[PDB]
Amino acid sequence: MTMMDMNFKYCHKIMKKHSKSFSYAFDLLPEDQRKAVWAIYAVCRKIDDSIDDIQFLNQIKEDIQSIEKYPYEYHHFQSDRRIMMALQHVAQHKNIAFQSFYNLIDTVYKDQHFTMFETDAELFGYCYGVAGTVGEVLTPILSDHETHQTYDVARRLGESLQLINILRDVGEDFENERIYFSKQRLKQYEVDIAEVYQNGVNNHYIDLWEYYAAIAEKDFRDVMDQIKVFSIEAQPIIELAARIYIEILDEVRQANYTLHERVFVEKRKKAKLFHEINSKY
Ligand SMILES: O=C(CC(=O)C(=O)O)NCCCc1cccc(Oc2ccccc2)c1
Ligand SMILES: CC(C)=CCC/C(C)=C\CC/C(C)=C/COP(=O)(O)O
Ligand SMILES: [Mg+2]
Ligand SMILES: [Mg+2]
Numbered sequence: 001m002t003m004m005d006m007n008f009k010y011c012h013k014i015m016k017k018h019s020k021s022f023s024y025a026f027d028l029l030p031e032d033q034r035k036a037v038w039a040i041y042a043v044c045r046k047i048d049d050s051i052d053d054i055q056f057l058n059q060i061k062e063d064i065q066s067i068e069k070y071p072y073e074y075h076h077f078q079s080d081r082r083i084m085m086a087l088q089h090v091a092q093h094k095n096i097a098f099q100s101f102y103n104l105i106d107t108v109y110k111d112q113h114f115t116m117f118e119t120d121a122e123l124f125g126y127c128y129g130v131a132g133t134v135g136e137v138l139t140p141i142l143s144d145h146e147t148h149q150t151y152d153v154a155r156r157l158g159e160s161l162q163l164i165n166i167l168r169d170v171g172e173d174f175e176n177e178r179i180y181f182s183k184q185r186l187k188q189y190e191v192d193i194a195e196v197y198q199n200g201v202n203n204h205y206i207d208l209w210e211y212y213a214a215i216a217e218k219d220f221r222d223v224m225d226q227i228k229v230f231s232i233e234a235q236p237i238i239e240l241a242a243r244i245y246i247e248i249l250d251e252v253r254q255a256n257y258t259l260h261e262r263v264f265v266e267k268r269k270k271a272k273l274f275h276e277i278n279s280k281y
Pocket of ligand 2 (some may be wrong): 155
């Protein structure tokens with residue numbers, strides 16, 4: 001086991017620890033793409049966790065900026081050396097959309113002074129910023145020949161997974177003084193998240209919730225129709241990852257839209273979906 005290997009194995013460990021669904025799916029890729037995904041994931045994870053002062057976050061961004069500007073020089077990285085070595089290795093072989101990392105970093109900067117979204121257009125803007133961008137970064141890894149269409153589909157997939165995420169974590173997000181539903185939309189459906197958190201679900205909350213779920217689902221289906229932008233090996237894997245994540249919606253409904261648990265897709269269910277998909281291919 002080389003050192004580079006150790007860097008990637010650490011990235012993997014972070015991905016397994018933090019996302020069971022994406023780890024489950026993406027570990028099925030060929031070795032080289034697998035590892036590229038571990039590293040991009042681990043970077044994005046560290047950015048997302050970095051605030052836990054802007055101190056660390058500035059260092060990550062400077063690291064990323066060193067790699068962009070000097071891909072083949074040795075850097076003394078300021079943040080997480082193992083993750084940054086791995087990302088540099090990836091960049092040496094693959095076209096990385098660095099500005100997409102900076103979009104993500106800017107978005108995380110901004111959650112410091114967080115204020116609720118006035119309109120769905122802001123919320124969807126947020127979904128681009130934290131997920132759409134990541135879809136774009138992953139594009140060269142998951143497709144042979146990259147076009148505006150490939151980035152488009154990847155970005156839409158990312159944004160739809162983010163919305164499914166938001167839909168899982170309503171209650172936990174509330175505890176952490178975040179609400180992601182737009183004020184426009186809360187007013188229209190006459191929902192008050194505080195009230196629902198205390199008094200349990202109702203038919204307003206459920207309608208609002210399902211408004212957003214219907215959007216995520218439609219975007220999901222539009223991605224699937226276009227799965228072919230991706231390399232032949234990645235298609236079944238990206239369909240797995242998406243399907244496993246959208247299943248999260250059925251889990252929320254079955255738990256009656258609870259705001260006091262994180263629902264989950266059982267591992268045995270992940271494998272069921274793998275079967276269904278792996279058989280179509
Ligand atoms: O917001 C959450 C998560 C969350 O709220 C929760 O769990 O509550 N995530 C958005 C933060 C940015 C980010 C971080 C890490 C990995 C990411 O994407 C990849 C990358 C590669 C493969 C799959 C997915 C994106
Ligand atoms: C295959 C393709 C283009 C995917 C598109 C980009 C993508 C998958 C995801 C962004 C969604 C996120 C951040 C979900 C929650 O984070 P965890 O990973 O659970 O910590
Ligand atoms: Mg997650
Ligand atoms: Mg969340």
